[PDB]
């Protein structure tokens, strides 16, 4: 080791060379105060709050920027360190507006808190304060720029992580202002995260505005379900109502960021809600009814069905507990037809081996790669923090990214190879220029989008991409620990439904149409009543009336993701669990509770009563669904690739067009986001 020895207040600590003073003090459990330093942004050094005395040095050093030399004694609590902190806090509070009551940052303000902890108790500023003109950067971020302390975390986030380059400083001196300088609207997929890292209330949440206050909120730690990234979140509630959604730091997923749908689609969670059971009346209209009547009218039809008479479509937001509940319920009637809306091709190995439908490398493994090939996807909007990790690897590891598909904006520069899928044969044959780039690389990463698998030639595309990945891995200098083949998912319910052995896509329903169809949250519109026979008994079970509920015969109001403790699996196979934040409104219930009560009415009672017993069943079907925050390695790419060479599906001539080309198509994808007024304001803002 080449660790240098430094001293924090006399305590010896062994640090790597290049470590700053602030990190060396972090290693002994001391936290130097800061406003412009952030460990996921570049070093700025322009608030001077981190000034600390190195002893035998007649000048304080910016600890966020100064690297430790060997033998320094960092005096984190000496007298001139404290005089520096009080002076810098006095200058930060000189022009700062007396807005602490009317400010959403109050109670959770860095400026308030380390004014209390490190600055003076009073003022010497006998002058008039400046007042900055406000800006309009969109419907998500309220902007009150008098509160700005010019820390430039705006600009470093928008430039380095969001990759936007629209925020900046105009002017000079005390008149220097943060903004876009024009009436420009900062609408990224990661735009709300500037609300998080702004230490003051200059950037605040416009949907959350004025409604709550941090001390009275309860903090439930939970999981995002808006995509298959599986972002860790804090659902902060107050008196039984969801107030807002913050991120949790998870280094391997979402480092501390979330997308704007994750942050702001929580107000769709209180519109359009299914609160009571509904049945069809004598006139064909959905009328409110009791749970006994609804479950009896579903069980009387389920007892008459058998075999292929009953099927099921799982939706995009369904937990694994309800998935195995509905699978065991339809297996009691001897029905294997349990399908998802998102099509994965069952050719070759299919969903048997886990490796050919996971992001097998990791989200973290993007930092280990050196060539990333993206096929048929727009990862900016399908998985925005997978794209944020790609941009971080682009920025710091000099990652070479290529794309096969439409030339979308990914907030970095990629090598656009073309939108034709025939290029997937030109790289696999070695007649393409990027093929040698894939061969000479040491950590290649080939990501196929699951939205490209919605095409009719999805088996052919998956075969070609797996052929490329096994041409690289088995021949070139890939070690064997490194995974090349990767599939990026966009649906939170998909990977848990494939691990439980559903049949992805509704080909098993279009083949032989059932006379009874369950819809666990199936609002994709995949199978309408023009596909079914004349009187199909459609049972919708979910939390919104969006698409599948207006055509149902019996409606079963379900819990949403903030309303149940619920296992969801991301695109990299990591099983995770939400917690209960609020309870479901009205007579709405948790989903597998509904399925289990239906099974007790139908006389085919499932062998579980509580959530732990559901999870014992869930371990019985695949034991990685109960090992939380754990990515399990999936081997056997060779055998899945040898099975994929059997059927020669033909590639179509249609170019790879992802369904999401612009930020317009980002904000509404599921039943919670389409029922949101905030997402509607976002769409109306980006379309004008």
């Amino acid at each position: 080791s080449n660790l240098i020895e430094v001293f924090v207040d006399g305590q010896s600590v062994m640090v790597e060379p290049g470590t700053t003073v602030l990190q060396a003090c972090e290693k002994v459990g001391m936290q130097i105060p800061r406003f412009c330093y952030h460990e996921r942004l570049s070093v700025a050094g322009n608030c001077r709050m981190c000034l600390v005395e190195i002893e035998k040095a007649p000048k304080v050093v910016a600890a966020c920027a100064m690297p430790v030399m060997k033998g320094w004694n960092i005096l984190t609590n000496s007298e001139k360190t404290k005089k520096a902190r009080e002076g810098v806090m006095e200058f930060l509070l000189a022009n700062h507006p007396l807005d602490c009551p009317i400010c959403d940052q109050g109670g959770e303000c860095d400026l308030q808190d380390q004014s209390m902890m490190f600055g003076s108790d009073r003022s010497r500023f006998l002058e008039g304060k400046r007042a900055v003109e406000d800006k309009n950067i969109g419907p998500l971020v309220k902007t009150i720029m008098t509160r700005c302390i010019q820390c430039t975390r705006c600009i470093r986030f928008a430039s380095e992580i969001a990759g936007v380059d629209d925020l900046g400083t105009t002017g000079r001196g005390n008149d220097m202002q943060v903004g876009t300088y024009i009436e420009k609207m900062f609408m990224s997929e990661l735009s709300g995260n500037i609300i998080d890292i702004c230490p003051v209330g200059a950037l605040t949440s416009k949907p959350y505005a004025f409604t709550a206050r941090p001390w009275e909120t309860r903090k439930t730690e939970s999981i995002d379900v808006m995509d298959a990234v599986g972002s860790n979140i804090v659902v902060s509630t107050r008196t039984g109502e969801v107030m807002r959604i913050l991120p949790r730091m998870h280094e391997d997923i979402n480092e501390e960021w979330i997308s704007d749908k994750t942050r702001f689609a929580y107000d769709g969670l209180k519109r359009q809600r299914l609160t009571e059971p509904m049945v069809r009346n004598e006139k064909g209209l959905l009328t409110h009814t009791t749970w006994e009547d609804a479950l009896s009218r579903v069980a009387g039809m389920l007892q008459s069905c058998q075999g292929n008479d009953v099927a099921a479509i799982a939706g995009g937001l369904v937990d694994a507990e309800a998935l195995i509940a509905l699978k065991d319920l339809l297996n009691r009637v001897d029905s294997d037809t349990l399908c998802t809306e998102e099509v994965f091709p069952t050719a070759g190995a299919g969903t048997d081996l886990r490796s050919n439908y996971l992001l097998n490398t990791t989200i973290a493994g993007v930092e280990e790669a050196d060539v990333v090939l993206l096929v048929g996807t727009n990862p900016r909007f399908e998985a925005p923090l997978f794209n944020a990790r790609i941009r971080k690897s682009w920025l710091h590891n000099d990652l070479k990214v290529a794309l096969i598909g439409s030339p979308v904006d990914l907030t970095y520069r990629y090598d656009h190879l073309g939108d034709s899928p025939k290029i997937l044969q030109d790289i696999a044959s070695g007649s393409h220029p990027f093929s040698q780039v894939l061969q000479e690389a040491k950590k290649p990463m080939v990501v196929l989008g699951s939205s490209a698998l919605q095409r009719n030639d999805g088996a052919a595309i998956l075969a070609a991409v797996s052929n490329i990945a096994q041409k690289i891995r088995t021949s070139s200098g890939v070690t064997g620990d490194w995974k090349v083949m990767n599939i990026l998912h966009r649906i939170a319910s998909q990977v848990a439904a494939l691990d439980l052995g559903y049949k992805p896509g509704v080909e098993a329903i279009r083949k032989n149409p059932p006379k009874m169809l369950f819809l666990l949250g199936a609002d994709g519109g995949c199978v309408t009543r023009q596909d079914l026979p004349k009187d199909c008994f459609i049972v919708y079970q979910g939390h919104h009336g969006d698409v599948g509920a207006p055509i149902a015969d019996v409606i079963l109001p379900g819990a949403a993701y903030t309303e149940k403790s619920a296992t969801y699996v991301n695109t990299e196979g990591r099983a995770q669990q939400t917690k209960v934040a609020v309870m479901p409104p009205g007579l709405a219930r948790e989903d597998w509770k509904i399925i289990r009560a239906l099974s007790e009415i139908a006389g085919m009672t499932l062998p579980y009563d509580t959530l732990d017993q559901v999870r014992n069943r869930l371990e019985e079907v695949s034991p990685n669904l109960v090992r939380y925050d754990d990515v399990e390695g999936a081997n056997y790419f060779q055998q899945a690739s040898e099975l994929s060479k059997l059927v020669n599906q033909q590639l179509l001539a249609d170019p790879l067009v992802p369904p999401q080309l612009t930020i317009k198509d980002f904000y509404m994808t599921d039943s919670i986001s389409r029922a949101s007024q905030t997402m509607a304001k976002c769409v109306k803002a980006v379309t004008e």
Partner: protein, 114 residues
């Protein structure tokens, strides 16, 4: 694993104290039904005594059952001496409480509780 006892060295002396406490409660119950002028029978109060003893019958720790005998003797001392009123004696009999749903199905019907 070597702990300090309270009264009982092992479970035999402990069960002896449990047995003496059950004897004392069984003897006390008719006087309790008389002087508090309860609206129950001696059979019913002795069944409540037996229920309160058999609720704790799964315990295998001598110190825990020593403290259970201590707290049972405190309950009995507060009953023999008229320190409880009729209300404190009848709080063992949850009479005004509605019967809870016991199966899965009625707990599903009434609310969210497991």
């Amino acid at each position: 694993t070597s702990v300090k006892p309270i009264f009982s060295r092992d479970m035999n002396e402990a069960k002896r104290r449990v047995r003496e406490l059950y004897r004392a409660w069984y003897r006390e119950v008719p006087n309790t039904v008389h002087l508090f002028q309860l609206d129950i029978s001696v059979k019913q109060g002795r069944d409540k005594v037996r229920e309160m003893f058999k609720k704790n019958a799964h315990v295998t720790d001598p110190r825990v059952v020593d403290l259970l005998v201590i707290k049972g003797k405190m309950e009995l001392e507060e009953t023999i001496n008229v320190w409880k009123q009729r209300t404190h004696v009848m709080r063992f009999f949850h009479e005004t409480e509605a019967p809870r749903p016991k199966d899965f199905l009625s707990k599903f019907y009434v609310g969210h509780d497991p």
